Amino acid sequence: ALLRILKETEFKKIKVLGSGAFGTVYKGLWIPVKIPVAIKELREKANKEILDEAYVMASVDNPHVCRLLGICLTSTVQLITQLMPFGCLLDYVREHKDNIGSQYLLNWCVQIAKGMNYLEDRRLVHRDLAARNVLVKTPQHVKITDFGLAKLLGAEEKVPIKWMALESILHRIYTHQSDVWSYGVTVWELMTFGSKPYDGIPASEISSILEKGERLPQPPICTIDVYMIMVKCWMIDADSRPKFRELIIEFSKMARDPQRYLVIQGDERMSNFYRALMDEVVDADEYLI
Ligand SMILES: CS(=O)(=O)CCNCc1ccc(-c2ccc3ncnc(Nc4ccc(OCc5cccc(F)c5)c(Cl)c4)c3c2)o1
Hints:
By secondary structure, the chain is α+β, with helices and mostly antiparallel strands. The protein is built from twelve helices and eight strands. The protein binds ligand FMM.
């Protein structure tokens, strides 16, 4: 079964990871061997529609995209997926604000770009792409998660405002090109090692400054070449923004000569922590082999 219907006794929530905008995520074990998993319990028979979108979250198959392993429909709804041992990309760059070289930064951009392009091939608009919604399987590989939920929970029926495209803020219009805007902010978050976008500025005034032409500032380590891509992602005209397929090629090219596009001191010179962090056993990987 592509979307496993887990019985309440099959898994157990052990600790709290964090509270999101759609629900609370827990880390735990899945006993079909014990499999370390992340369990998302949504905030609030209608499960028919839920199972439908849930299916999409489970049918994705790409190395840069998280896959839903199962669902549990009791009073509330619980989504179960493989636990990403390094947590989310946002906290990761924050913690390693130093020891992170241009090679990693660019490789992540490529990876996230591949994941988004893949979702575009499945005609799936993410709607909530951000550094906090990118997981770290290993420092070498990251994966996009949390897609599908926005739509499911009524994102386009009568608020990540700082990651949203102008058209999304004003008209609830979400397309693959609105995802490209969010992609731009996500990249900005990486390059600034986790800065908060438009920090300080009130959400209600964002559409206003965007219309004025204001955009997130050029990250210190970025050559104007990398920043132009970010700016191009934030164009009012959605069709003028880069395509994920083009972003893949551009960031991949930049990844061949990282020190030419990103200027970080000591770039060249650039485990137990996450064990004591996440450890409460076979990877969902081995088990699902
Ligand atoms: C970064 S911050 O300062 O803003 C706050 C920190 N964020 C809280 C946090 C820390 C760590 C995690 C975390 C760590 C490991 C994880 N491993 C797997 N999944 C995680 N989250 C998650 C996201 C979505 C989920 O269901 C929806 C979905 C949609 C598409 C595909 C899918 F596979 C799943 C589930 Cl079940 C878990 C996770 C979070 O969340």
